[PDB]
Design a protein around this ligand. Structure first.
Ligand SMILES: *Cc1c(COP(=O)(O)O)cnc(C)c1O
Ligand SMILES: *Cc1c(COP(=O)(O)O)cnc(C)c1O
Lengths: 396, 396
């Protein structure tokens, strides 16, 4: 059977690694993958997680199976973090959440539930968007249509074109929104812009699917949730897939959740059982470690306070590197205004680079950026900040 | 969209929990789920894993993403544990393995790879078999046909009927074999019987898919692998899905692997990339914790020695409870020969009970067994062994 088999192509992001990693070149700079990197260029494990991990080590008595939906406590916390502390969705029992292996596994679990218990056959994903999106949905048999998003000339959210590609989306179709820190543009809708998409969506009969993979990285944990919350106030049904990989630095432990809100308790209970049936057929129940770490930190007021401070530092370091980037460029010799990257948020930014400029840095200079022209700012330090803006003014 | 939605039915195994758990009855006995239980009725975390876990805690420097296939070291070990220390499949580079979220996730990853890169459309699964099998494969779009297996009268492997249901399986179809400790019968083929299925399968053009979820629980770690190894000696292509949940007591951490052997290096490399593409579309990369625990124990000669001793004790306790069961029954008052359960292996056994006897114990007696008449012997202690055989001679 395997004699026919065609080789799979490169993952748009993860293929660059084996080129930096395997580049035997000395003075490199990575700037590719969306994994945070501190002042020293290390991706350390948070202090609050080290503390929750010795705690688990002292207290775990069994490795016995978690429920299909996982740790109850982890469920509750994800809900409060998302909908708010006194949220009516929580009070009316309209939300149900399942712990999943990553934000990607919550996306896929949403995919398989929709693709077999529902009308939907089409998912609208922005242009551009996180590459693996299309691939997850298509794997469920659904098809990916892409509304417009970004003004390649003004480096902003082309709102009009956004609305003007969305009306082609008919009712009972799913529209996918990045909750905060849009991957890869970093451009996010204003609150007014969300209050608008909220009504166009209620009026047009859409099913919103929020991808929350960076809560806390744009402005705050509550601020970054205002859009989802604006949509959750007027829709009776919506789903949200979230990830704790980047905001807790728990990347390789695979922790995320897929919450489903329905019109009421009876419906979300009944719809959740099918979501559960979907999980039981994929991976049987979720991995305990990274989830219990998150449940412990969030449940304990001493540990949680350290966690938010750590998140606040990661956020404040990226916010500082962005400014270091636009200034060093302005000093190294640039005939181009990169001030827009200062207005963008999260770990990523779309430089104004062509696929041939990206290739010119990577070859003649060893600096690595996805062909997309996307550079991870949380991978710039004050130390590498100089050979970086030198390479960029050379290629400009 | 969710107003239509039909409630999902009960999982054949996991629905009984909420009935024992939620049974407010006092003198209970569970006997349902396939999770080991020691002399005290506790599912403790192994000593060798507690030791590997403090080790990870002292040494982990980052929670950064694992490769799509996971921990290399974990890959190598799974191969040697399966194929053997000086195995030619390993030496010729014909094997490739991906770490997955459980044995169930290795089954599913096999499913999705086959269902989209291959000819196969049918999977042969024994009668009976682990319930979730059918459900995983059907989820991939494939269909489940079931060959015969068990002689409900002689409590053995009906070999002839086995062969006589298998010829209907045409070439390019997948036949699924339990490597050791057949769930739920506990009846396993002899080595001669495997050397026979090995040639019928090479002669008929089948694709073997081994489900290894209990290596070490029948006779040993190497002994329990003789069948797979007999098949791997004469087939050029085969896949095997294994789980470390029960044999390392790592249930809720989701650790298993999906190995793929092809005719040669070039083919397995090329076929593996597609397997990888399948993973990247499900859950992005695997969970690190439970896998690194397994890699550490197996890599270290001091830790490994404790691990095998622990496995040896679990194995020897079940082997003793089986004998306690046939003897206590023979003394409590039984007009039936249960000696067959002494000849069966692993955690499970098919009592000779009717769905109405199972229901009679569970109601009038609080003893819980799946309607299947399957009782987990690794859930019997010398303490509960008496009200157990009393209930069974009452219902007989
Ligand atoms: C990182 C990311 C995710 C999910 O990542 P997981 O590692 O699988 O949690 C989802 N969406 C976007 C835009 C992301 O950047
Ligand atoms: C337990 C089991 C598996 C896999 O279980 P995971 O918890 O997902 O590893 C596979 N096959 C059988 C027969 C089993 O009993």
């Amino acid at each position: 059977m395997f004699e026919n088999i065609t080789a799979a192509p490169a993952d748009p992001i993860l293929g660059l690694a084996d080129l930096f990693r395997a580049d035997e070149r000395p003075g490199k700079i990575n700037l590719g993958i969306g994994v945070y990197k501190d002042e020293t260029g290390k991706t350390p494990v948070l202090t609050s997680v080290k503390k929750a991990e010795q705690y688990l080590l002292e207290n775990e008595t069994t490795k016995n199976y978690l429920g299909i939906d996982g740790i109850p406590e982890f469920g509750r916390c994800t809900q409060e973090l998302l909908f708010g502390k006194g949220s009516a969705l929580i009070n009316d029992k309209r939300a149900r959440t399942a712990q999943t292996p990553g934000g990607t596994g919550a996306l896929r679990v949403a995919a398989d539930f929709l693709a077999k218990n529902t009308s939907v056959k089409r998912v609208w994903v922005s242009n551009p968007s996180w590459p693996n999106h299309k691939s997850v949905f298509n794997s469920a048999g659904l098809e990916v249509r892409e509304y417009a998003y970004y003004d390649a000339e003004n480096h902003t959210l082309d709102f009009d074109a956004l609305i003007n590609s969305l009306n082609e989306a008919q009712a009972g179709d799913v529209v996918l929104f990045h909750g905060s820190c849009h991957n890869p543009t970093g451009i996010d809708p204003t609150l007014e812009q969300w209050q608008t998409l909220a009504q166009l969506s209620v009026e047009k009969g859409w099913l919103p699917l929020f991808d929350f993979a960076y809560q806390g990285f744009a402005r705050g944990l509550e601020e970054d949730a205002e859009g989802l919350r604006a949509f959750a106030a007027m829709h009776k049904e919506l789903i949200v897939a979230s990830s704790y990989s980047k905001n807790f630095g728990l990347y390789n432990e695979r922790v995320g959740a897929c919450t489903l809100v329905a019109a009421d308790s009876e419906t979300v209970d009944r719809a959740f059982s099918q979501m559960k049936a979907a999980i039981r057929a994929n991976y049987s129940n979720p991995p305990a470690h990274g989830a219990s770490v998150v449940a412990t930190i969030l449940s304990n007021d001493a540990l949680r306070a350290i966690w938010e401070q750590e998140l606040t530092d990661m956020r404040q370091r990226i916010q500082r590197m962005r400014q270091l980037f636009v200034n060093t460029l302005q000093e190294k010799g640039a005939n181009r205004d990169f001030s827009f990257i200062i207005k963008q948020n999260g770990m990523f930014s779309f430089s104004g680079l062509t696929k041939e400029q990206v290739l010119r840095l990577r070859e003649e200079f060893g600096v690595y950026a996805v062909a997309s022209g996307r550079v991870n700012v949380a991978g710039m330090t004050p130390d590498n900040m100089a050979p970086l803006c030198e390479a960029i003014v050379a290629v400009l």
